[PDB]
Symmetry: D4
Subunit: 181 residues, 8 copies
């Protein structure tokens, strides 16, 4: 495909570096952004949320695991575990919190926050890794009700998610995106 | 008109990005900066005040609504309301305060702070939206005497306004500007 | 409208400076790129063709008239006429050739090169202004068969036009664009 | 693999943009630069040769086909054919010469120039597409002995190839690279 | 003076580097751009003409003497004379032509080209230094009718001068500027 | 003078923007940095101290008066006074502290801190303007022993001053500089 | 040597400015990074640790002594001593802490933290200079158990060190590096 | 030495990249620019002359050998010889001319052009390598009276050399520099 409307919307909606990282990640997992365009938008959204999350809090509070190649990501995970003494997670997480000393798995869902958190928690099993779910509707849900960041940073993330939703809807792209998850 | 003295003064007085945003806003509302030059200076001044205001306080305390196209501005307004649960304002505001959780309408007047605040408050009706008026004389007036920012940030804004006034006066542009409002 | 597929395609297809100049031109003529999207793509295409044309030939062979505000454009036209002694054109042209000493009116058509050239020539009447028409199919037509530039520069322009056509077609935007002219 | 010596040598030997384009091309064809490192070096070398070749001659003499995604590459090929009237090649070429009006297939071999040219010519069949082979030893071979560029540009390319060879040899990487083709 | 309309027009009309060089030159000669504003515009115009002139022709055809501090300017003059064997001029010139091997004194006048050339030629006496006068009306006059540059470069300079004239006139600044010389 | 050793040392010792501001200030006061080189070094040192001082404390705690043209400097002074209600100083100060609400006059001396403070205090008379003197030996002295900034920022300034002293001494420039004040 | 695998790994592993500073330091001490490659990696690692350390804490808390030429480094040391009154250290340290008012000697070891600290403390004798040792295994050791920085900054440094270790190991470079110290 | 007047003059006289390359070259040959300052100025001058020389002529006419580390320089020399078939020079040259197919050894002397050319020619013996000597007085001398470049490029180089001479003289540095060779 030379180009879809979802792909053009993604390129005009997200920062170029985020788009390139999403393209690299999908191609690394044998996915084509030109064909799997809803997945493309999903990777971009998850990446941007991760970056805004890391931008919340102190200057070097978080180590960003997402947005790297899985080799480098696992290298940084091993280094964090071997210096802090934290259990090596079974699946690759999104961030590491040096303040709370724990890995963070970030989720962005078009369903109910409750469903996706249940899914992620069943996946990781190891309750050591903190979970934080955001929805496009504005709800959020974190392990032990410990939301890690300030209310204002989380509010910025939720506002951004709702803007993305409105933008997709105005282009008649939101319904397929919502049903795709 | 190939150029007026007010337009040249505006271009040498305000930052280029602020000038471009003011030009876009006026042209979006069917106004010509080359002809309506006092309005041009007014849009530039209001924009710069809004930006300095947002620069006061924390890094991401404010969401800037002014300086966008009204479509994007209303999109961001809808997102803020639908994530925070705040009443949708009848008229487009200037900022959103994530700390105090409220929209802000900024005003810059050449009259008395009292007159312009009365006008703006009669306009919005919805007392939910905070009002903050600055004058070129150095006075200020905010809803519930809650001035939102530090004294030093407000002082910077007032100093800038007085510098703009002096600069216009030295070019014999201040009298027409003052009588234009 | 918060966004159409033609608008997103335009933003991903053309350079940002060209997009901004097209937006300024349309808004100056009371047109909205968010609504009149085929016109948006047309202004961007015409602008890019003009810029590539000026980039053909010597370093400072051409004076670019298109892409300015009509006040500045007419100022430069008056200067060119009052220094070279060339007849002031009735309608604003696109370029001035210092080598051949003549104004150039560039056209890009989705119809037949012949039809659009007839239209432009009937418009200007003053045969002093050279006409050069390009089509999306790859044909071209210039006054007195004097094509001004090298074959290779014209070939680059025609290739670019055909790429734009293919890109629009793959997004199902080409048919409405073609029927819009 | 977290990293090989060939990969580190490639990253220190070639420009970053060339490295990124090679990585994209291999991943697009289901190849991993971290594992297939000799192929990695080969893609980087071929890309750099193509870019130097295009930099020979006039400013816009060549249209660069290599270094794009095959969708965009074939789009540009279709545009070139549909504007010039040239036969659509069966396989994607490397460049298009607007001066000589023909597609160019560039080859870089560690064997004898003669062997690789025979292979490429048997591949394309369509004698319309010009062939130009460079070797790491400094020899070259072009269709109809028409070498397209100046002697000095070709000399620059050959010098660069020999420098790459020496650099690989000093790191004991040249023998495996040579036997890999 | 905090600012005049001529000064604001100068700052919006000329490139910032040219403005800074003019300010430095005037202050070096005990002149204040804020007060002597017509002189300010004149220095900016003469500087821009000199730069466009040097930009005509080959890459390193001209050595630019104007726009330096007189110490460095005379140092470069001495070097040019002591390497080429050319007579040291009594007054500082504007350029040196390595092609024609001669110093150039550039003039921009609001009077008749003839008057100003007579004045400059009486000044230098040494007929070795070439003279080239431009007017705001579009006329030009060079020693021995040897105009040094192409017609197209000179045409660009004349067009620019006429644009400056129109811009000043639209702001009612041209009459005082014209009568000031 | 084409150049002294003090001037070359100044250009290699201080940041280029600081050098340009010092040159502008001296030329504005009819001083030549090429001749009055010890004064040149003194202006650069005073400027750098002022900038480091303003960089101490909060982001927008200080309004920088030094390093502007006296017209703009007095304009900003008038604005600060007319918005805060502070007495207009008889002589132009260096900074304004929005936190402590007072103007600051910074001094850098090669004599004893006590002598220079006595001189400055006799000069200003108006005890409203805070005084803060630094020496090249590392001593400091502020009005009412209120040193305004943290100990660490002042320590940075003193270290820088001593480095400047050592650098001048190693070039045999310090003795004349010390005796020049 | 035209290049080793350790040198290529160093160039791809560390920031270019850090690489250049390490090269300058070694060449200043008569060392060749192309030959003494384990020393090259060690200088780069020590430099990066010093820079991360200085980046911990306040904006201007630390004066960086390492990464300068020893002449400038000793000049800054003399200035710090002559302004704070601190004993001049016998050997050049790495940093100065303006908060704790003391020089810091940073060490990075592949042995046990205890051994290297004993060595450094025997070296300096003057107990005035604080010592802080990091290991590639993640341990650390500071004088008087006063670790100067936050736990999170130290954790970042330890994670980086372990990543460097893993990267060297994957290239079979870690064993020789470890045995080289 | 913390700094000499020759070193400060060198840093203010030559471009920073040229200064860094000269520093690297001297330190690579066990020379200290802070002590051997006349040699420092000589390396900078020779480097700048080489760069201006390479900038004469076509875009990629010359391969620059000077300004590299001798390992890379000899690598490029070997590549040039092994692709062109030119005799490997006994001593490292300065440039390679792809047009004339020969290595160039550039010299800059404070003596007579004749003496230094005799010295260089006795050194290389291999008459294959072209010699081109420039003097600070403005004379020049090339093998077989073949001066390779245009008269205007050579004139630019000679003018620059004379400017350097005047600048050194005004600082009383020229006599020691002249007697040092
Ligand atoms: C470190 C670097 C890239 C970072 C990605 C991340 C991006 C960051 C950029 C900031 C500035 N903002 C904010 C406004 C716009 C912008 O641009 N934000 C945050 C918000 C959106 C965004 O874009 N950050 C964080 C540190 C600095 C930086 O840039 N990444 C990518 C994955 C790992 C990582 O740390 N790296 C590291 C090596 C490869 C690379 O690219
Ligand atoms: C975000 C971006 C532009 C921002 C406008 C605003 C400008 C800001 C720039 C800062 C840096 N300073 C300060 C010194 C000079 C300067 O330059 N300030 C504040 C003071 C004056 C000024 O200029 N800000 C704030 C965030 C970063 C940024 O740049 N705007 C424009 C409207 C919406 C918005 O957020 N965006 C967003 C998309 C379009 C665009 O342009
Ligand atoms: C002069 C300046 C803008 C020019 C517009 C035009 C754009 C030019 C840019 C070049 C570089 N390339 C080529 C590769 C990508 C790129 O970027 N090209 C040509 C091809 C596409 C493109 O983009 N040119 C030509 C001169 C330099 C320049 O930039 N314009 C705008 C209208 C009038 C004008 O002269 N001006 C003048 C004042 C306002 C402004 O913006
Ligand atoms: C156009 C742009 C990238 C180009 C790639 C190519 C690179 C070019 C860069 C030049 C400058 N030099 C020379 C010195 C170092 C440097 O940097 N050279 C040539 C030599 C090595 C090199 O790097 N060129 C040529 C035009 C301008 C440009 O940059 N490409 C990539 C594939 C298609 C294409 O045209 N594009 C187009 C869209 C995506 C993108 O990236
Ligand atoms: C060399 C440098 C400055 C030059 C001044 C001159 C400016 C030149 C810039 C070009 C690019 N263009 C063209 C488009 C806009 C732009 O910017 N043009 C020419 C047209 C208008 C303009 O601006 N040139 C010529 C060489 C490169 C350069 O920049 N000058 C100043 C006096 C002496 C000199 O050679 N120098 C030298 C040392 C101090 C300094 O500043
Ligand atoms: C605002 C701007 C210039 C400022 C001068 C001052 C310089 C500042 C720069 C910072 C960054 N650092 C720090 C590291 C190196 C560097 O570069 N520091 C402080 C330390 C030395 C230095 O250089 N500041 C402060 C605000 C941002 C800025 O740049 N000035 C000049 C006089 C008035 C003024 O506010 N302005 C305003 C209009 C004209 C102009 O130039
Ligand atoms: C000051 C300057 C260079 C500094 C070196 C140091 C580098 C700093 C750069 C920052 C930004 N980050 C962080 C992200 C990537 C990056 O780039 N960090 C810290 C982490 C790694 C890194 O790179 N710092 C600190 C002040 C600003 C600066 O750049 N140095 C070199 C030795 C002395 C010194 O102060 N100087 C001073 C004169 C010569 C020179 O080069
Ligand atoms: C290629 C690159 C550096 C080059 C050095 C040389 C410098 C060139 C820069 C030009 C632009 N101008 C001209 C005006 C000011 C300026 O800046 N000129 C020529 C005149 C003075 C100057 O500075 N050139 C030539 C090609 C592009 C470039 O930059 N060198 C260094 C040695 C080998 C080499 O090719 N490389 C290559 C790898 C390392 C590196 O640094
Ligand atoms: C958005 C995405 C892929 N949705 C999803 O299906 O979840 C898969 C997942 C995987 C691991 C942990 C938790 C969930 C997602 N990916 C990750 C992620 O970590 N690595 C995937 C990198 C990638 C990117 C693009 N294509 C394939 C792979 C998330 O952490 C996350 O939250 N969402
Ligand atoms: C400076 C200005 C326009 N003066 C004014 O007449 O008030 C109109 C107003 C509108 C909404 C709320 C409150 C007041 C002004 N505009 C806004 C603003 O929000 N959107 C207007 C964008 C625009 C810019 C230029 N032209 C037309 C429209 C302000 O908020 C504000 O304070 N002042
Ligand atoms: C693409 C466009 C507008 N199509 C068209 O309808 O022709 C109108 C036209 C006008 C003058 C001469 C010849 C033709 C076009 N505009 C111009 C042009 O010069 N100024 C128009 C600036 C503008 C841009 C956007 N909206 C309104 C106005 C062309 O020269 C050209 O070729 N095409
Ligand atoms: C370094 C200097 C000039 N030494 C001095 O003789 O004091 C004169 C002075 C003037 C006003 C208040 C206090 C002292 C100095 N100048 C200023 C200053 O404000 N404006 C002078 C701008 C200038 C720059 C260069 N040349 C002439 C004028 C200082 O504030 C300061 O401390 N030192
Ligand atoms: C990594 C290194 C060199 N390993 C080491 O053998 O220690 C020598 C040392 C020297 C002084 C104090 C403490 C230890 C090291 N150098 C320094 C350092 O300060 N100046 C050396 C600059 C240099 C760089 C490269 N080659 C030669 C010299 C350290 O402070 C440190 O910790 N490690
Ligand atoms: C300016 C210099 C060093 N004067 C000189 O004594 O001549 C020595 C020489 C060497 C080879 C061929 C011809 C002459 C000079 N160096 C070179 C040069 O090539 N490599 C030297 C790199 C270097 C830089 C700094 N320190 C030590 C070595 C020249 O080519 C040249 O002309 N002058
Ligand atoms: Mn996740
Ligand atoms: Mn408002
Ligand atoms: Mn047209
Ligand atoms: Mn190929
Ligand atoms: Mn002149
Ligand atoms: Mn002061
Ligand atoms: Mn250390
Ligand atoms: Mn040489």
């Amino acid at each position: 495909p030379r180009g879809s409307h979802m792909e053009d919307f993604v390129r005009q909606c997200f920062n170029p570096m985020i788009v390139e990282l999403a393209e690299k990640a999908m191609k690394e997992y044998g996915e084509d952004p030109k064909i799997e365009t809803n997945k493309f938008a999903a990777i971009c959204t998850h990446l941007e949320v991760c970056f805004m999350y890391s931008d919340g809090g102190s200057k070097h509070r978080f180590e960003i695991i997402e947005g790297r190649d899985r080799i480098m990501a696992w290298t940084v995970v091993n280094s964090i575990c071997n210096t802090t003494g934290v259990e090596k997670p079974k699946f690759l997480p999104d961030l590491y919190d040096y303040k709370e000393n724990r890995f963070i798995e970030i989720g962005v869902t078009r369903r109910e926050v409750h469903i996706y958190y249940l899914e992620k928690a069943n996946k990781i099993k190891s309750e050591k890794t903190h979970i934080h779910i955001f929805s496009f509707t504005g709800e959020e849900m974190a392990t032990k009700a410990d939301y890690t960041l300030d209310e204002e940073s989380r509010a910025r993330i939720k506002t951004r998610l709702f803007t993305i939703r409105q933008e997709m809807a105005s282009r008649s792209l939101w319904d397929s995106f919502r049903q795709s998850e």
